[PDB]
Amino acid sequence: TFGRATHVVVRALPESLAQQALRRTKGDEVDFARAERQHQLYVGVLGSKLGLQVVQLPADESLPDCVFVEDVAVVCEETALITRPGAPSRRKEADMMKEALEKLQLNIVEMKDENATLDGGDVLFTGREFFVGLSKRTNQRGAEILADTFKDYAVSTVPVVDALHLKSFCSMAGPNLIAIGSSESAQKALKIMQQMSDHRYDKLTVPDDTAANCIYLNIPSKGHVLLHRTPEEYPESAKVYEKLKDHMLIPVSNSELEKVDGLLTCSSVLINK
Structure with missing residues (x-):
């Protein structure tokens, strides 16, 4: 069943994250203490609330972005692709x-090609196929290695325009359901993805691109579950998610790490064992 997961890998925030953030903040500074609380709440939802087995990796002060585990691995079925992040500081x-x-007993495939880069954040897995964003972090070679790793799934690329990652404005909200932002860039990207696929996807359109990044899970003890940004953060987008009457909706705060481009999906790697 799509979205099923039994374990989740997360990683603690390094104090060095605050320092590196000083050169990324477009405005308001990052409240590190609050970022830590939001991370604790996030992990609490995944582990205590939903029952996933949590693998908590310790922070590495030499790796300021270590909390963003999604960018370093892409898992599909029983195989894990260990990526070669676009940013050298994250290798x-x-x-x-x-x-x-x-x-976790997964089959491991490493992206060693020195001319290939790929951030997990640029990968959208629909359950039927992969869409890989060609951005400043992920290149063609990287997409090809992912395609060679998950041979039983089609992989199509899409240009990432005015955003960091493909998932900066989309993510799966349920079976055959793609949450998508309303910006010119997001809508164009969606049109391209739909054009390349031979399968018609349903969509959940939200007014705030960032709020289109959510985490969908299928929990046996709860059914359809969706972690989405709070009404306090994005009132208009939360109103859209409320339309999913068959989903267990869980509002999750992420105001701090969003300041450094870290969205909801960025802080976890889900595994189905």
Whole structure:
């Protein structure tokens, strides 16, 4: 069943994240203490509230972005692709992630090609196929290696225009359901994805691009579950998610890490064992 997961890998925030953030903040500074609380709440939802087995990796002060585990690995079925992140400063994050996934007994494939880069944030897995954003972080070679890794699934690329990652404005909200932003860029990207696929997807359109990034899970003890940004953060988008009457909706705060481009999907790697 699409969206089923039994384990989740997360990683603690390093204090060094605050320092590196000073050069990323477009405005308001990051409240580190609050970022930590929001992370604690996030992990609490995944583990305590939903019952997933949590693998908590320790922070590495030499890796300021280590909390964003999604970018270092893409998991499909029983295989994990350990990526080669676009940012060189994040390459070592693959070390502990590889160990974590090895211990979860997954088949491991490493992106070693020195001319290939790929951030997990640029990968949208619909359950039927993959869409990979060609951005400043992920290149063609990277998309090809992902395609060679998950041979039983089609992989199509889409240009990422005025955003960091493909998932900066989309994510899966349920079976055959793609949550998508309303910006010119988001809508164009969606049109391209729909044109390349031979399958018609349903869509959930939200006014705030960032709020289109959510986490969908299928929990046996709860059914359809969706972690989405709070009404306090994005009132108009939360109103749209409320339309999903068959989903267990869980509002999750992320105001701090969003300041450094970290959205909801960024802080976890889900595995179905």
